[PDB]
Design a protein around this ligand. Sequence first.
Ligand SMILES: *[C@@H]1O[C@H](CO)[C@@H](O[C@@H]2O[C@H](CO)[C@@H](O[C@@H]3O[C@H](CO)[C@@H](O)[C@H](O)[C@@H]3O)[C@H](O)[C@H]2NC(C)=O)[C@H](O)[C@H]1NC(C)=O
Ligand code: CA
Ligand code: CA
Ligand code: MN
Length: 447
Amino acid sequence: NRSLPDVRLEGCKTKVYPDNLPTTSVVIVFHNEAWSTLLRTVHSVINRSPRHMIEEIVLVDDASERDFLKRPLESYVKKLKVPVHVIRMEQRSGLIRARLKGAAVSRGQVITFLDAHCECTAGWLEPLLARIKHDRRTVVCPIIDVISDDTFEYMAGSDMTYGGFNWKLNFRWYPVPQREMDRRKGDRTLPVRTPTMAGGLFSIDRDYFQEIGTYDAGMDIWGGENLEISFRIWQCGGTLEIVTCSHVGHVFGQIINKNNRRLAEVWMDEFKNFFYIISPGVTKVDYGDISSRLGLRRKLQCKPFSWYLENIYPDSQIPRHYFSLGEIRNVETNQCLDNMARKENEKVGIFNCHGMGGNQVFSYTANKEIRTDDLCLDVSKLNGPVTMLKCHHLKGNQLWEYDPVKLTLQHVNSNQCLDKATEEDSQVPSIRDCTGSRSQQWLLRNV
Ligand SMILES: *[C@@H]1O[C@H](CO)[C@@H](O[C@@H]2O[C@H](CO)[C@@H](O[C@@H]3O[C@H](CO)[C@@H](O)[C@H](O)[C@@H]3O)[C@H](O)[C@H]2NC(C)=O)[C@H](O)[C@H]1NC(C)=O
Ligand SMILES: [Ca+2]
Ligand SMILES: [Ca+2]
Ligand SMILES: [Mn+2]
């Protein structure tokens, strides 16, 4: 234990929570974690938490190998305020397996999951439990602050950042949008409805966890965190929030795709194609049996992935409605726009349509944007270069009007059209005054 400053939002410091919040059993799994780091977490939990709110602390050793973790730990553990137990996985298991085990061992009404490398803030627990007490079907996440791995210095995380995800099914941090600000009328001290969760840290009602099917043990153990429990909670009646008054620190192929297929085949209905279409060959990855989970979904009678995009994640990166999902082919040159695997702020290229999806996959969305995953085609000056920028959902320079009859794609702000590449810059589309050539005619086809 060391100290920190109060990183909570001014208003949080005054809030009073009802009496008799439930008791929680923090569950932490570890693997060869350094001694100091592991105990800094343990101590932060006891010192920063009101004793009558903590049941016990369960430390799940995931088949470590380091000497100090064995008897010294147990020794050191049994001697202190809060009861701390040390469960041991016989032969390497994985986070899911370890959390499942340490959870079946806990006895608190609400289970809190943390990593072996975290540090709790002042006032972190009360707001979490208070939320769950208001509604048992609410899963809660504290704001995740940053601890350096080198210096270990502290940097608080913002209440204006929440969980989303991209076409590749990767979890990602995204800015809280207006709707969430309008809904809370500006009071940032009110919890945020996050479309997804980092998976790292969260608290949940003991009985609610079991009720929505805990975790999918069919996923391979070297996988890790997933969007899976996030889609599950929402589509199946629950509510997932980031309690902005709670802060907690954290120090910062085939396997990955197996879990993506498992969660995508089970929850994303037809939107799973956004992931498949841009990952040619991921279809050869064997993802195991999902019958059980498919059973669970029908048992709980969860709502469609579409219900989730329009109600819970309107500012999603995967479009709920789209005019096309495929290649954008120039009718004159028969070349296709393609991201060339480049990153945000980079020039979108153009090359002969190979007709094999992937990097030549684009979507002209209902929001009139020409996007590929989380990037959108952006123009800022006449004849300027058309680059791929992070999609802000505000149109403007990322607004393109398509004419399905005339086949044009004009950039609204500049008042020009898109056509074949010019010379000297032979490998990129261009934006020029609208002529009417077959060169400014594009075919937005659907796979
Ligand atoms: C590419 O695929 C998508 C979906 O497979 C095609 O868009 C879909 O178009 C249909 C018909 O226009 C849409 O259905 C309509 O939806 C409205 C909702 O307000 C409903 O009131 C109508 O009765 C009708 O059912 C559908 O929503 C839309 N799909 C999505 C996800 O946006 C698209 O046409 C295909 N590409 C092309 C243009 O060939
Ligand atoms: Ca099950
Ligand atoms: Ca149009
Ligand atoms: Mn971690």
